Symmetry: D3
Subunit: 222 residues, 6 copies
């Protein structure tokens, strides 16, 4: 790989974005390699949890069209992974970088994390879920504000609003995340995949139907 | 009843879970008696609000299958109650106990409350809404984390994330809760049932349709 | 206008509710003028962002009881009480910021939630006390509150009528920003000017895409968003 | 039961509405006893398929407390399959009961309709919902607004019923279908019914996922 | 009006599209006048049912600013019922207008289609949405992709229309239906139409709750 | 390919199922080759419309599971194709073969066509959309009947119920289908993809939202 680093240590695959010259901004090559790295991790029977991270400075600072379906296949590639993916976010996670963090299953971030959707500054909009996942996760006011004004959201507000699960000091981010990934790697792999799928039903079906789906999956784990 | 205590005063039915040796864990008998007590309260024209609580130590610490539809009819019994149900949560509300609290209309909890969904530790998953209600109420990151790692959530995080409405000191929990229940009992019973049903549409229909439902129900109160 | 004031400056239409004797309670006249003013702002190519505010004491302290009294079911159903007014606000394609100070209660809380986002002062108090009158929220208080802040707090507010202060509103996601009372309008007009600096097509597209979040499954919302993103080319 | 007859043979429960002098109009007693007999059939390990029918003249010709709520919910919660064998009139609540069943076999004399509008009310047990989803907006709007009847051949052509047979073959056709269903795996049959019913509650993409997960669990 | 004719008689408003030289094709002015006439009929306490029709030759043969949005919203907001009486061509915009009405009665000369693909665009007023939901994926996909026509017999067989009658009976059949609707409670008629239209917006379980609550309020 | 034949002529890719001794039953090899042929047709800028057909006798007469997601990847490969696919059905289209015909964008069939879902006879159910697409396309009674009893549906009933668009004599099936495919090949490729995508929204979103999506796609075709 030329834009990412992949390390497999004791059932956890760690994928580190590696474009320091561009503060880990997404591009065609990085997105292509990331999806490949994720697909290899999914097919690797030893991998039980995935972690995506960037640098202390930036998780990822930013990033015809209809026939090529720009941004479609990459989003699909990540969403198809059945194993869990934790985003470990330090510093900037902006634009596509914020959207990548929200596509992961949950976020653990450092107290320096800064989130934002500044696409409007370029005359376009979020194109990988910034108008959709942000709103569902943190509520209309904050998502509308962020998407319309481009304002940033700090780690404390991110935790307070439900964008992230845990905030820890920058020096403890990787320790917190790998401990969580290890703990997930201790669980039944079938149950882990079922949990992820059931949780993700929450944004696709009426609650009454999501309860039925959950109960049938629960019963099948017997 | 053998596993619960029921007291009706001033239009409030207080249902207390009473399995102290199991820390109020939900079993067949308790769920069966709980549903019966709720149905009696629904059919009791003197009851205007229901409260469910456990002990100071635990609200509730935890909880063939296809043909018997394990956990289906119990959940449906609780969800069909039209009168409002407040959960007064002290100490542990884990697994099925967390799920019961989330099935109530809102939660008031003490500062000692601890929530969690540790079903994954047994190779199964939440089977009474833990993957559905938790996600919809507090957002993807915290619900994914809780369901995948089994981590607990303390009272302060529960209020900050929207899982509970109010947190009060341990010694004020029942005073705070009963005063809320008595405020509800002062209101029109028809309007209270309409309120609860309208709010619950929020997780079943698109917003445009929920707005139409609310307005038609509002009009019917004339 | 009799009950509101409209001032356009730097591509921002500021609409100020002006029934101070009544703490800016909504009534038939105010709602009619408000919707007219929003439609004018929508058709005004000078306007790129809208701001609604009340007084320092009250954004809007409720809805006038006379809007509902003296009416039968046939009246309110055949007339579709509160339907046209809500639809008139929701159809506006330009963004609307609510600058909330003091009381935003009942219909006034619902108005703030129909806006695209809220900036409030640290004196703001929100609530849905309709249940105190034997009725319920009729302009989205049972729907938007629940979806934005979660079931527990919405159920509690709609059933008990309890208030929510500015700090809890921000912590629960009801509002985007809380500032001191002295900076409320400066914070809000600066955000509105920032929005007015952007492409008007992209701004309307952002607002429409965000609002899909409450109408379609996420998978379909993602498809809609990507097709609109692509159409901006 | 005073108003219904229940007969169990070859793992099929035949439930006959027994108010023929009222053309099997659904009153409080019939509806209560119908739900009770359905619940008994569900809890009866010998029953694997259910059939509901009325008389040759009428399947069922018309009809805080949540009026009509509990009855509809009681029918909808039955997990075993229910076939409606419809002869003659199926009107109002009777048409709605037929549509609540999993599918309809009807005789060529069957007549469907929703004439609730004639009384100043509307369908209150699914006539505005199931009819529209099953046969399309034009015919459902027309039936609900004008009260017009739909005959057996139009019912099959529009998808309201699955099969039309001569009046003298109705029970033979239906009991043969029901007996065949009752020979199948009970778990798979309940799974089939549940998956099919997802079609009206979830987006197709999600219904596909549900169906595939249920299919897999049958392993 | 310059593009339409409006006649009110015996509680029925008849709106006739009148662009003979364009075979009643929809344009800015016609849609503007149609919405205005519909809104006047909504506000006219004398009108209880609306009918839209064109000529014997054509119902309607075709068609930042949100092109085609506000007019569609204006038609969809009408609470009183609207019957489309379709003779001859109902194509493109004209097929979409007919589907936006509450139900269709058509002559045996009616011809439906969505030929927008021929111009390098697509249906823009519901032809990809209502057609599919009313008649099924296969025929809607075929019609929208190939531009093929659908005759009156196929329209009734597939559920696109409620009734097909001879050309000379179209207006009599339609005005009789409109008169029957005008005999009913206006509150119940508005409720019925709104309940039926829930069928395409909510899960069935929720549509049933909505219907039951509106039914109960009609007391 | 070993189980299918693929021929591109005049912007139409004809894919013929070719397991005649098995009456074109779907197996792992055929589904793998079919998906490959579809993806190649999608990436082939000369292809504007796809046709799938079998033999005169049968289109297709029939055909660990959770971790491998049995039948998921195959269904998803067919559904992601953006160009249109016509099913030309003669003779038997049963089980997985009926489901394959329903996954295509529309069906033209001969008067000898026979459809059915006999999975229930094996103790399983439809696992590739037979419980979902059949019901949505032709109504609850006929779908419930077919799925519970395994009864066949003949060509006339298929057209009458909306399962197929057109029925023609056996000798005219391929002529009718290729002429339809040529008509589609004459159209704008971007508008053809938009039509198919807009039509398919009909089964995923509320009608009001599908109208919004349709109008925005219509506008962008400018």
């Amino acid at each position: 790989y030329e834009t990412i680093i992949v390390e497999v240590e004791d059932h956890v695959a760690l994928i580190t974005l590696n474009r320091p010259d561009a503060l880990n901004a997404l591009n065609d090559q990085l997105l292509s390699e990331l999806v490949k790295a994720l697909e290899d991790a999914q097919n690797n029977d030893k991998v039980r949890c995935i972690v995506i991270t960037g640098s202390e400075k930036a998780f990822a600072a930013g990033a015809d069209v209809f026939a090529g379906d720009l941004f479609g296949p990459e989003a699909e590639g990540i969403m198809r992974i059945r194993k869990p993916i934790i985003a470990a976010v330090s510093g900037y996670a902006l634009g596509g970088g914020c959207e990548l963090a929200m596509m992961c299953d949950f976020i653990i971030c450092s107290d320096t994390a800064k989130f934002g959707q500044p696409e409007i500054n370029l005359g376009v909009i979020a194109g990988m879920g910034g108008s959709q996942r942000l709103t569902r996760f943190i509520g209309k006011s904050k998502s509308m504000d962020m998407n319309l004004t481009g304002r940033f959201m700090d780690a404390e507000e991110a935790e307070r609003s439900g964008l992230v699960s845990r905030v820890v000091p920058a020096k403890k981010l990787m320790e917190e995340t790998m401990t969580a990934a290890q703990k997930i790697a201790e669980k039944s792999m079938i149950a882990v995949m079922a949990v992820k799928e059931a949780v993700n039903r929450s944004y696709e079906v009426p609650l009454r139907e999501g309860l039925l789906f959950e109960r049938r999956v629960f019963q099948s784990l017997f």
